[PDB]
UniProtKB/Swiss-Prot annotation, chain A:
The gene is GSTA1. This is Glutathione S-transferase A1. Homodimer or heterodimer of GSTA1 and GSTA2. The isomerase activity is inhibited by S-methylglutathione (GSMe). Glutathione binds at Y6, R42, Q51, V52, Q64, T65. Keywords: Acetylation, Cytoplasm, Isomerase, Lipid metabolism, Oxidoreductase, Peroxidase, Transferase. GO terms for biological process: epithelial cell differentiation; glutathione derivative biosynthetic process; glutathione metabolic process; linoleic acid metabolic process; prostaglandin metabolic process; xenobiotic metabolic process. Residues 82-204 form the GST C-terminal domain. It is found in: Cytoplasm. The C-terminal domain may form a component of the hydrophobic substrate-binding site, but in contrast appears not to be directly involved in GSH binding and is not absolutely essential for catalytic activity. The lineage of its organism: Eukaryota, Metazoa, Chordata, Craniata, Vertebrata.
Length: 219, 221
């Protein structure tokens, strides 16, 4: 069983949790609670650049989010059939990541910039990203983004749509193919089970999770 | 068929790492220099940019946008991404740390003037105390000429590229890392990297104030 080192929160670990779950892979979590808990991992030599996420899998101590996901994805045949496929898959998920990152960091944002940035994210969603993934689906009219078959692109995209729904339920409304993907994916039995209460799925980060984060990561 | 074609402004930015990867692999490419807000708008209205942004590279029938999507493709094609899934893990771990420090250096110019000093002081701390030791430790782990699999890889090329920008910022920084020093000399001497380094190659100057202005007009920031 792979073993995930992170604090109890979404952060930069959630796309790994959701991709393990979708692959039907069972896993352990070791939760950092304090800054003493992080420093213990550092000291023990466990963290290449002294940072989490880290995952123990197949005898490596794999740090860096993209290093973790690229590996999980090949292992479980969620990374396409060849390097042209990987290429489309990579173009899509990096664009997802780019929006992902704007959402992820919105609460560590200085208070006086908060309104501006939320506004910009919504416009980007409406004008940049959703039209881009709607035009891919419409292009081929298939059930999956790439290769008429399940990949990490579907998993990362649908994950992200849940996060946008929590922001504004109106945003997706003029994107019918995006809605239809959301449903179909959320109905795959492994994804359905992750979305169910009681799973490892993590909630949005409230104020006191943010505070525990400033404590442990010292920002 | 077709040389690859690179769409960017005339500057390092986010295109440079691709320039250095393709030339290291001995791969010739064309370059089309974006020079104005209107030039960018043309490529948007022609349907050329998946997210309306550059870098974009035409290669093998594709219009690849996103640095990492372009680099992963080029690396794979010319056998610079290890020999298996496990080698590809170690490569990605290393080159994502390089990207992290890489990002810090790139966005240095667009800092507010009052924070510039604190944020140079901080780059410098992490280099000395986090990033340089981690790479030195790897090289010392196996005593081998390359970072991964004792065979030339994209991590070697990205680390050495970055080794150059750490030097234009401060020469004293790499000077307590003998193994990083040695790697830099070695890779710089391979025939294709040597030919990227010499005058008149597509290799780009450090970004200046003027060029920070043209970036502002073009990308509208
Ligand atoms: C609003 C959510 C914020 C949650 C906290 C940030 S994630 C914790 C942070 N880790 C990273 O920033 C890792 C970045 C790395 N590039 C990756 O993607 O894995 C860390 O250990 N930082 C500690 C350090 O740098 O010492
Ligand atoms: C200060 C010197 C560095 C200049 C950086 C600007 S690069 C231009 C920028 N492109 C991106 O940031 C794409 C990022 C993307 N994730 C990638 O890595 O390719 C852009 O098209 N901007 C236009 C837009 O997003 O609207």
């Amino acid at each position: 069983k792979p073993k995930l080192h992170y604090f109890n929160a979404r952060g930069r670990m959630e796309s790994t949790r959701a991709l393990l779950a979708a692959a039907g892979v069972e896993f352990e979590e070791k939760f950092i609670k304090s800054a003493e808990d992080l420093d213990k991992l550092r000291n023990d030599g466990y963290l290449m650049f002294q940072q989490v996420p880290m995952v123990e899998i197949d005898g490596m101590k794999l740090v860096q989010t993209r290093a973790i996901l690229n590996y999980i994805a090949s292992k479980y045949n969620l990374y396409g059939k060849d390097i042209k496929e990987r290429a489309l898959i990579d173009m899509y998920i990096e664009g997802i990541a780019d929006l992902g990152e704007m959402i992820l960091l919105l609460p560590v944002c200085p208070p006086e910039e908060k309104d501006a940035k939320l506004a910009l994210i919504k416009e980007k969603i409406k004008n940049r990203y959703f039209p881009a993934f709607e035009k891919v689906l419409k292009s081929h009219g298939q059930d999956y983004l790439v290769g008429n078959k399940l990949s990490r692109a579907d998993i990362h995209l649908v994950e992200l749509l849940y996060y946008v729904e929590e922001l504004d339920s109106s945003l997706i409304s003029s994107f019918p193919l995006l809605k239809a993907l959301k449903t179909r994916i959320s109905n795959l039995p492994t994804v359905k089970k992750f979305l169910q209460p009681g799973s490892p799925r993590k909630p949005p980060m409230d104020e006191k999770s943010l505070e525990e984060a400033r404590k442990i990561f010292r920002f």
